[PDB]
Ligand binder design. Sequence first.
Ligand SMILES: [Mg+2]
Ligand SMILES: [Mg+2]
Lengths: 474, 474, 220, 218
Amino acid sequence: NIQNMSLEDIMGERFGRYSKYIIQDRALPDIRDGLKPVQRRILYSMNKDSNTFDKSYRKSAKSVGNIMGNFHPHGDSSIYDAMVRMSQNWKNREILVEMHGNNGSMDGDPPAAMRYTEARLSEIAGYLLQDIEKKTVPFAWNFDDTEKEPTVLPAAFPNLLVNGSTGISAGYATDIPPHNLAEVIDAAVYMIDHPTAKIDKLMEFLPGPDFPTGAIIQGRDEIKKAYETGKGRVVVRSKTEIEKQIVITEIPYEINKANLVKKIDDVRVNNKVAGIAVRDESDRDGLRIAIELKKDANTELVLNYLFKYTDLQINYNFNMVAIDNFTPRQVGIVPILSSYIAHRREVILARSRFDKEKAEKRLHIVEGLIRVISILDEVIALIRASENKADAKENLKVSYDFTEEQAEAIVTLQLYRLTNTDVVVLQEEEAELREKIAMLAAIIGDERTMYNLMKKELREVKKKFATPRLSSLE
Amino acid sequence: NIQNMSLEDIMGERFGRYSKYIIQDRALPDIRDGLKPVQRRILYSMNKDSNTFDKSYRKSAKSVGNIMGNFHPHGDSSIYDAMVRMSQNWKNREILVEMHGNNGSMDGDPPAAMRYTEARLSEIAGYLLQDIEKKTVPFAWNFDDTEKEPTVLPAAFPNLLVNGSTGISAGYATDIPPHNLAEVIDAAVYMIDHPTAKIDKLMEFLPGPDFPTGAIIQGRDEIKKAYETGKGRVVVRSKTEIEKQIVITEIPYEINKANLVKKIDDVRVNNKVAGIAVRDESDRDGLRIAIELKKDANTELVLNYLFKYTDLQINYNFNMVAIDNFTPRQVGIVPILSSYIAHRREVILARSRFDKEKAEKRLHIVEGLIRVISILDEVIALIRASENKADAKENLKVSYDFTEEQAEAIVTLQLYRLTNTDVVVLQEEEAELREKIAMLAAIIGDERTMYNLMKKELREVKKKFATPRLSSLE
Amino acid sequence: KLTPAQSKNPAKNELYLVEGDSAGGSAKQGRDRKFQAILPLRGKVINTAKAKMADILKNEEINTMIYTIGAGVDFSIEANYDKIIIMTDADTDGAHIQTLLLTFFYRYMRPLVEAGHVYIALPPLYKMSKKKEEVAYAWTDGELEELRKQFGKGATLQRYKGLGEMNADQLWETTMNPETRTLIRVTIEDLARAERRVNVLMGDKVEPRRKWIEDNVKFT
Amino acid sequence: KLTPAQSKNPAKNELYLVEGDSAGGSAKQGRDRKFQAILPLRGKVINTAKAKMADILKNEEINTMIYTIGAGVDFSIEANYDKIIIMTDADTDGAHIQTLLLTFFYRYMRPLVEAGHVYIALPPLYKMSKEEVAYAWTDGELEELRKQFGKGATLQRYKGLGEMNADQLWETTMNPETRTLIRVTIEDLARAERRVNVLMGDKVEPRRKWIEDNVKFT
DNA sequence: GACTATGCACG
DNA sequence: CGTGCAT
DNA sequence: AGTCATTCATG
DNA sequence: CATGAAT
Ligand SMILES: [Mg+2]
Ligand SMILES: [Mg+2]
């Protein structure tokens, strides 16, 4: 047996398969929850295993094993390395994982081996997962068909813009700068009300990136270009002070403090510029790089040179590419924001639909017990005169035409439950349910009532997690 | 602040700590279940996670992570490597782990990386764990104080002799050849009856090692020495056939088929002996090494040479050292067998004690419901006239002087349970319990009744897992 | 280091190229050592169409290949096997490596490919199972759905996320034993088309690759 | 490769010898870079009393030590630090490494040890919390800590140094103000030689006896 | 997708 | 040298 | 207790 | 030459 295939065609399929899997499944973030698969699987798994901010930490390696075993058929290092990135405040604006021990740093030192460290999900992360358990989101089978896995998260906040993301696949790469959770949500809410929103106005809310590493960002013009088109180049300058000596207390995002320092001193030794005279004195709680100068305090020339010749000033590039509709799009702020909004809509509606059914069920059951409490004597008498649990059930259905579930509920009632015969209490819950159901039915078919609830939850999230800007605009 | 210490004393403590931990906690097997800690923790963990012979396999790495996280604070490789050894039929006589995929082989090829493979506990392994859950064995806290871990296993069979063990610590090393599960248990049972047993008689039962790799074992005299003293040297010869050519179909335990083959052909090329004329033709299901000869069929001289000059015949050394009473002993068969027996005694007694309490509890409860079924009417009437579940309980205790647990049991009874008012059925269980309790109370204080039960279970285990000898004696 | 066949007979002896040592084990084990050799690579292979000459010949994995095959990069022929068989894990990362290995052969060892000596071996991804056992194999997603329909309830599904994850007997019975196996035979039916295609996908330019994706990758 | 201190001042500058890169990170991070250098080793160190000369000097980890310290193996002195501090994970495998590192210093760099320049740093194993927080260094300490915290307490065990944070490593075991160090001196020579050669020796037979007689397997 | 160095006892 | 748990 | 090769897009 | 997911 042999199938004969060409080189062109074989190369064709085999490439197409991979190129696709890479784009969707590996590198590129979903435009909805702004996560790559590994990220999502880590989050879901940790949370399912209730490994959460409020409870004790847990041996990273145990976490990694479970992810690998249940959801993610790949290297441990790929997984844990990714998990670790999510614990890095100089990398992410709003961290989704808290790790206790050594998880690297700005000097670039390598994260401690996984067998050493311990991890949990952060607080805001829970918000990414909020409502997951109330059928709010599409599930798929895992690779084994053994257990079910979310295809996207609920997403209480617009993670995509908040923590940015990068970014290397076949044919596509992505870079998305972090943003100020507060400011982002502002943009979101504004759009929720005025959908036909122009970028200029949105910019009043989201005025450009917010790097966790602080720093100065200059390039209003190109930032707009980025927000409209999806591509742009911006300038980022470390933040400088002069002491009577040059003090550095913020550096450009994605830049390596350690090497940055060597490269500067290399300037001195090569005496590539005048007054070069360089020390790093940084400790747990503050960044400090001291460039202390000699005689001819040509400092302005020296500083201006350093900006040009070293990575004290660099440019950051925007390549905002996410997966929308199962496909690679290069998108601006408007598509991201919009698509996030429309997502939250599906979420809210799906949630409420689930909540409503649950309400209606217990309601039908409560409606039931209320009837029973009136016939209790004769009801029990029947149950006793019955042969089997099942026969017991079948007799109530026949006689007092109760329903099926109503029957199981009456029958399985324990005994001390009879200690509480009181149609008032049940009636109290009955009101409660009826009011919830009617509230929900509104959201479901009330489009503006729906959008308002969105706006509220969003505002509530802003209040909880909002923080001052770290990066400045020039 | 500074504490001033000498070199002698510091070196003293620091060595003593390590030497000890290594001996007890790492290298040396417990004389009772014949396991090293890693082994035990693997077994317990897998089983607790119900990863068992009867159910589907599970991603080794998930298994490894859990062991590391809960019980075993060390390298994954150390753990998984150990787990893999336990899956190796050419290494262990009776395998305690079944692994699906590549777990190495006789050619010595390295086991597939853990992310690739899948594993479960074998069937006989369950027997090592049998009764674990009925307080049969001393527990300790894990390193974190989060969960409790067995300090030894129950041990339905004498694993120590069966799967042997080795064996490198500070001051001590161990080598213990595998044995024939059937023959071992014979020895055990005989000793159970005739404790003052001499080695000569025991030898009639356990006549020396049984290697999973088959082979020929010659050295009756030194085997006795080993069984008495704990140290001995034995000769092991590969099993040979002549075809009309030398055919090899069994090789010496712990020997490397691959290199063994090279070393033979090296004899030919170096023409170190006469008729050297060597091919390995082995496939999944059978070992075959062909040494096909030239003209002067000095074959006997050639074979006799090969035995001397290569590892076709080697000697195996006995260094039987286990941990008894928290300490290193070099022990013979008699101590091993005895100490195993005495263990099983504690197990059986502890088990029965647990079983008895459980019996007595439900019995007290059954005794209770039987009373109630007579007063059912008035009882329910009381419960209804009661305010709280708790008040409900307190009223029965006051009025019908029921007990505390009896009360919870009556009160929590669901409703369809009233469908079954029938003192006959309860009385049936009541008999059952009383008969079990009285049986147990016997074992507990009946020493021979206890030993008999041991003998039975042991025989039952022999019947289930027994297999023909693989290794032959000359 | 390689695991060679007993007989050295360039007429009927196959060289099985594998994605790593772990898979290598599985291969070596389930296999007819009379005429089957096994050569491990260390993961993803150098893009021979994106790097120069020195960068290439200097890389261990390509060099080892060149040696164990004979002919050489120029080329020349009959050494050394009448089949060079690319056997990668069943997933998509496997398909990438196939893509890379093929371009290397296509670029340098061209006569080899034109000749009809380069094969792709097609090992299972999924195995589904329901003394009485029913067992089927799938090779990609779609196949899985149909298999699932067949087995209906009860079935367990196993996915070989890497070759070292299936056993010896399995690898043999399914994908190596010539009696019951099936192989893909790679031939080039233009030259111009091949060059055209390889250079876009495997090329260095990106801009065209991207377009080729957009236009042809069906992200349904 | 090492992480050296800002000032090069052999009068007050310490060299912290660590069990690996993962721990190295924790060290480098929580630390006063003015006078604290950090030098990682790749796990268990060569038994310098069981191997020859060439085997030894040829091993990377010993050689790197010799270089970064100055003096040399003969020896000579004042380079390069007025403290060489052995800081190993808190468990027992740490204690083994301490044993190995000490014999190397004792065997070759003897003047160093006789001088009073070799230190052992004593980082926590267990931390218990109820916030009320205590630290334990070995088993026994744990029991007493457990009694104190009674119910509710969570216990954490640093199974390796890279498992505690920066602030922690500093506050507990590196900051001279609140830290405590062990200072290793030799108070015979003959006794030291005698002892080292048994434990660390090559002979086994004596070591074993030393174990039986003195290792309390309670 | 793989690899390397160390301790420890023993023949 | 290699063996089996460890760093 | 560590380490190394390779893909992929972009400046 | 990183960068961050992968073999
Ligand atoms: Mg693969
Ligand atoms: Mg350690």
